[PDB]
Design a protein around this ligand. Sequence first.
Ligand SMILES: [Ca+2]
Ligand SMILES: [Ca+2]
Ligand SMILES: [Ca+2]
Ligand SMILES: [Ca+2]
Ligand SMILES: [Cu+2]
Ligand SMILES: [Cu+2]
Lengths: 720, 718
Amino acid sequence: HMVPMDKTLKEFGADVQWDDYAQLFTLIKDGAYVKVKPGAQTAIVNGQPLALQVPVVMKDNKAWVSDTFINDVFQSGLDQTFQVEKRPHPLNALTADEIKQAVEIVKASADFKPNTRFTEISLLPPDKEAVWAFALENKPVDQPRKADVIMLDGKHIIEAVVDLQNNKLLSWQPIKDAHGMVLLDDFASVQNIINNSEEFAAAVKKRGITDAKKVITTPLTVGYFDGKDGLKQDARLLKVISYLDVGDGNYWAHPIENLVAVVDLEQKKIVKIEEGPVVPVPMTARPFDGRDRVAPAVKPMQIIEPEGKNYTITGDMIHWRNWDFHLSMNSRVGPMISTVTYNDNGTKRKVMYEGSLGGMIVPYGDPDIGWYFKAYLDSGDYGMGTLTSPIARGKDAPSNAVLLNETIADYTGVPMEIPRAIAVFERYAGPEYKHQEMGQPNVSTERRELVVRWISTVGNYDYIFDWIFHENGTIGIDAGATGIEAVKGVKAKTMHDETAKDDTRYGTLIDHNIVGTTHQHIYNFRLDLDVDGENNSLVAMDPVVKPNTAGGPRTSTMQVNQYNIGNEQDAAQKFDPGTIRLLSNPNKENRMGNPVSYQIIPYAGGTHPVAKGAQFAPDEWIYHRLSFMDKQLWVTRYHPGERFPEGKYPNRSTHDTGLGQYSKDNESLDNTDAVVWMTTGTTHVARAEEWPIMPTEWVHTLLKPWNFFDETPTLGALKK
Amino acid sequence: MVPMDKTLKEFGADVQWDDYAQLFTLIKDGAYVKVKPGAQTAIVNGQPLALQVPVVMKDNKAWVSDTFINDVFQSGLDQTFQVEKRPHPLNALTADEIKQAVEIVKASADFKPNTRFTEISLLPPDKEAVWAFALENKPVDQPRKADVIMLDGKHIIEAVVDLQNNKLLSWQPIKDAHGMVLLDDFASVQNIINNSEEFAAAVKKRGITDAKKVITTPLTVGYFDGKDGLKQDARLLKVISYLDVGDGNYWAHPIENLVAVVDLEQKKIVKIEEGPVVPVPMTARPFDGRDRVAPAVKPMQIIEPEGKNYTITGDMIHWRNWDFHLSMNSRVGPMISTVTYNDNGTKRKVMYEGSLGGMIVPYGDPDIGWYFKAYLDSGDYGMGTLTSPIARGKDAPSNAVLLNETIADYTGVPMEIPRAIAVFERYAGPEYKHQEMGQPNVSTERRELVVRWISTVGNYDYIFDWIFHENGTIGIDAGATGIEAVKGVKAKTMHDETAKDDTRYGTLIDHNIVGTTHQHIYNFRLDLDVDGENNSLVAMDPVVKPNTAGGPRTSTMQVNQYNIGNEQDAAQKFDPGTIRLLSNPNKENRMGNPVSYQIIPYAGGTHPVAKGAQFAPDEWIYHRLSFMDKQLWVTRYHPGERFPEGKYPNRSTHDTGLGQYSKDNESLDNTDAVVWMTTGTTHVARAEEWPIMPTEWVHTLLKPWNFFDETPTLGALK
Ligand SMILES: [Ca+2]
Ligand SMILES: [Ca+2]
Ligand SMILES: [Ca+2]
Ligand SMILES: [Ca+2]
Ligand SMILES: [Cu+2]
Ligand SMILES: [Cu+2]
């Protein structure tokens, strides 16, 4: 027997194109570009012939293939994008087996309790020195694979370390005062507690809502206000904001304003209900999925690489042109880019040991009851890797992308495979360089960039992060924000109504009775650059206008003030895009005697107004708990346990355990292992064009080689 | 028959043969053709076409009829280009109108024998009549007219001709204006240096044994109130020299501290400045690949097999909800005009005319061969004239459509620039996306239409992209590549004795070579008409204010909004943390908010950013060019105010540009406004940029702000 071609291929996820004139099918899936003619005994995979025992069969207008067609063709070996890893990289994430094993090891200890949940189960990293010797010298790492197991016993955090090689528990440590992040089952518990609440149903009814079963709740962290919010610092609490499900697929458009419930997760009950004035729920249907729109006609546009890709993925290692790097996934911060080297005429030079999102914060600026405490720490409090959004092929990434699946542990400790978790794609990016000398033949080369894209959705917002490898050594990091705006229900329908002015004091009126409350998106990236070695120094170069003292007609000249930034505290600063900040290697120079360096640009542009810092007065607590938000550049000494800008346990934290802590000792940054932290973000003032769904807005950052090379990096191999 | 590959490649089409499918895929601009040897039909943009003569395979070479190209590419099946039956009134002068305008002024008794033409361009009907043609199809009823600026020796004269009636309407000598640099000026300079015994002697002293290998470069001298010792009435050019050593890159061999001043009317060197002798850097530094081998790469193609989503009628581009006119000017390049956004069936005004306003590349070295260096690329050299034909597939993506444009050369003869502008649609990530937990995903792709133009002036190559986003946003990006202007120095490494003095004004990028610090300042003139002529400039500053509503918060996020009423207050520094809108106070969206466009002069860049001019306020270049120190400018619309640096910037003594246009400080309240955006970079060099510089880009944005009533890309309601 055989199966229907279209059905099967689509299910498999391949794009299927039929050309009636040529009597040819073109099948595309990740790195495979296939051509097959009905009745032919051979097919073409990435330009190479593949024999087929069973030919594609055309019947009454239906194509049919053998039940082994998909594996014989796509897994043939002619698509060489993916290769088998021989010597397993020491930074490879925990496999599903290793995750299951870490879990049995802790469950075997006398303390595990039934309700014990897992906030994070991830590899405990081998020492960095041994990881680089493996990457560069191929030296085996002789330290045993270990896993960090962070548990939530009810509301108490315990840190456990297991030895996977020797299958034994190495430590089990209770962490006092820390609160755990919000876990998936907490969302279900909140909805259920609200649904069983007699008082909440009553509160809801007096605000116009008849069927309380149509109320959608959302769980938010409460932060810390030293008790002014009247909440016990000890309790595991979440605040709940509600909306009305009107059947348009967008409950976000029907807020129930001024009604907040405080839920105690251990007690499984509403412990408080804050209520303000009654504002009629905005009821108009506002779908964003197209159900009420016409679908325009558009002509096809495909980006094709008919002979395969220029990069190769061996296990989790990506090789592309002069770049080599390891890519893995973490449940909290998402993708981690490691052991990044640049092949310089045969020698692999170190560039970055570990790069990843550090953390982010989304603080609002309305003082009202349903808004004052809102300051989402998306990755730390919700787990962005866990909330990864599978890539919609051809839409969220170009038609020529390769989509990778990634495995992480779910909160119950069971392996979870995220399909299409990350997209890898090469892209044309204009001319790399060009010179059209008058009267001579032109000189132009195309620029190509390798993009590593990941998207994570947390509640109403969808974030997109791109790690861009330029063929010339430059590295870019862009963040895009899209999704549905968190909105405030208000009485004005227009700016002409009487309550308009007060309703829009903290946000723009983007629809009738709807205000897009002003807020900022602040992203922080932790980048452990090792500029051609571990020992580096921070150097400043500020372009300045100085009086001319050389004679001639000019009164001024353009010079530069160069100085080293010696310690962590002076390295924590605002970034003036008119200046230059370099991470240099004082032990190595280029051909002209200049220290090989990388220029750090925390601010390379953006499509929304830029956040110059956090928009909070200095006496606010969110301001105090999170310093990372106010400076764009920070440089700290390498410490394997300093990974988050907001701190390891930010939920209801009372003091900075993040960048403020990592730099408080003000250590020396002279000729030593440094870690760069770039903070960038936007200040979002809404507009009608962003409702019901917001157009993606992007922020850009860059890392450029500065005298790291001796000449134009992509000129090509020397002939003599 | 005729040989296919030969014929096709001569035609400029791409030919691909797929032996497995026995199918040829032919691509050229908007045409995507498929044809099999012996088939009685072919496919052109997904539609069947009957052939009079099948393609024939002989000795493994295909052959096609002598009529193939025409019957297939010109079949009508490629709908990319449509006939323009009623010409838009801003259509550039055609080759015939250029020859006619030239005959009208040559018929006058005031025309002198060796007169040159700095510019021959359309003198357009008034703005109101042009908008009525675009929105109402109302015929403009004026004869076609041309402005014809001549250079008689060193004397500028402005004439106006009526092409229809074939008569001269005006002839006006322009006192004190100096003409721009014309192409023949480049050869006189070289000839004049070649025949000068004094210069050859100066050169010999500097180590050059064969003066014939000396390559000159002509530069405008600027103005220093006489401190440079130069006469103001003289047509002068300064000359910087390099040594040709056969590497195809004379820029890599500067002859430092040797500058000659040439008087173009006397045809002679009228002054020579000599400084310390620095041996010429000699090592071959080719940038053309003669000494390199590129690594092999797998192919990548961007295809649109059914044709494009845009249509080009004459110079009118229609794409999705956008409609605009594209024309070429010899001084500033492309002009985007009568731009409207089709909002559910009704065309709304967005921009009457947009184009590069002017640009400048000022240096920061005080030395003899550098202190006066300040290139006004479009104003002094003519960027349109110097357009660089697009290298298909490399300077623009493989799915672009390349347009030819015509302008007049300095002798008044029409010149057709091949592949002068690239038009292409591109995928630009997701337009929007929302993945609600446990629900079906919602994602749409973003498409941008790019209009790209490249111009090369001396050593620098500039790329400009005008980006139409489907959602209403318009981006304007400027990329810079080419060869760096370098200074010869003695230091070979930073360990050498003179290294510190040698790098005071620039980075040592090669042995004995310093890339001198300088800035790149671009200015865009944008005659935005936000849903109408009458607009106002509104500021919105996000600020932190004390909370007065109760609750735990000590502060709130609010906005300080206020109108900017006059030209002087509108000339300002741009803080990327604030919002600046051009609003139409007479129209509002569904929520009662004035329809507007948010202006963003600085949306990013890859090189350090210029916050203003890196010049002390008493520098002459600073006084002549106020545009360089403010990122946003708004002035009242005036047909003759088009260049930020002024109409005649060569050796200008005062600001005749934006400084003059705003001088009067007029009202900007509910009136026709013109926005000018200044954006720039501060370039401190590195070794990664030598011998050839990796393209660096700067980005600007114009975004609809409550111009619409909801997400513009959702679609029409069923
Ligand atoms: Ca530290
Ligand atoms: Ca480091
Ligand atoms: Ca206007
Ligand atoms: Ca004026
Ligand atoms: Cu936002
Ligand atoms: Cu430059």
